[PDB]
Amino acid sequence: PQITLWKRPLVTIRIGGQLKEALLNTGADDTVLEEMNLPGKWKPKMIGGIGGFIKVRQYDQIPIEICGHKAIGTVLVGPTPVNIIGRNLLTQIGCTLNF
Amino acid sequence: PQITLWKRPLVTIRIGGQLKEALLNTGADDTVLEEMNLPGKWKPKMIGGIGGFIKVRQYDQIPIEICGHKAIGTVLVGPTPVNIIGRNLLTQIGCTLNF
Amino acid sequence: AQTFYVDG
């Protein structure tokens, strides 16, 4: 689709069998989801943003469906205020900024 | 233009008679620029991200130019590592997400 | 990496 920005670019995703809402975030290098269970091995990692650095679980090669579009990439789980789809997956679904 | 997301979507902006690089950030409600001595009245604000909150100064009615496109609105100024163009101005320049 | 969610 084309998505305007008068409101938060929020979408439904399917990850691990589960539906959630997530923010399309061109200002994030990475994808960071709220605390949840995901199957597979995970590595401990830290990321940062505004307000500083957090500890997260890193899952590699996780399939996720984003507004009907298939991605498979690294997904981070931790105390983020909002589910965030970063550029690592936004590139996979062919997302661009246009004006 | 059309900006792809392989790399951080950085643009040139003109603000307070300065040239600057900034991030086009669909994940940001507001616009947050690195510490700079804007003339004008301001109020204190707290804004949140991944790791907590920072205090910023809010300036209203600030003219700004994003890659040749003129806009005018609220700009927050504080200790952000990156100049951030949030949705308040991205809507003004006609910017969309497309996939 | 870096993740610039801003909540205003």
For chain A, the domains span 1-99
The label of the residue with tokens 């689709």 reads A1
Tokens of B18: 């300065």
Asked if C8 has any chain A CB less than 8 Å from its own CB, the reply is: no
Query: Nominal resolution in Å?
Result: 2.2
What gap in Å lies between CA A15 and CA B65, rounded to an integer?
39
By Cβ distance, the residue of C3, C6, C7 closest to A30 is C3
Which of the four CATH numbers 2.40.110.10, 3.30.465.10, 3.30.565.10, 2.40.70.10 does domain B1-99 have? 2.40.70.10
Which residue type is seen at A70?
Answer: K
Q: What is the C-alpha separation between B93 and B69, in angstroms, rounded?
A: 6
DSSP per-residue string spanning chain B: -EEESSS--EEEEEETTEEEEEEE-TTBSS-EEES----S--EEEEEEETTEEEEEEEEEEEEEEETTEEEEEEEEEES-SS-EE-HHHHTTTT-EEE-
Query: Which residues precede gaps in chain A, with C-N > 2.5 A?
Result: none
The DSSP secondary structure of A53-66, one letter per residue, reads EEEEEEEEEEEEEE
Is any Cβ of chain A less than 8 angstroms from the Cβ of B46? no
Set of chain B residues whose Cβ sits within 8 Å of the Cβ of C6: 25, 27-30, 32, 47-49, 84, 86
Find the residue in C nearest to A28 (Cα).
C3
Closest by CA to A79, choosing from A26, A34, A29, A48, is: A34
Q: In angstroms, how far is CA B48 from the centroid of its own chain?
A: 15
Asked if residue A84 lies in contact with residue A32, where contact means CB atoms within 8 angstroms, the answer is yes
- In whole angstroms, how far apart are CA B55 and each of A5, A49, A51, B43? 25, 14, 9, 10
User: How distant is the Cα of C1 from the closest Cα of chain B, in angstroms?
Assistant: 11
- Chains in contact with B via at least 3 Cβ–Cβ pairs below 8 Å: A, C
Nearest to A81 by CA among B54, B48, B30: B48
Please answer whether residues B14 and B33 qualify as being in contact, where contact means their C-beta atoms are separated by less than 8 angstroms.
no
PDB experimental method = X-ray
B31 shares contact with chain A (CB less than 8 Å): no
Interface check C2 vs A, CB under 8 A: yes
Contact A28, A87 (CB under 8 A): yes
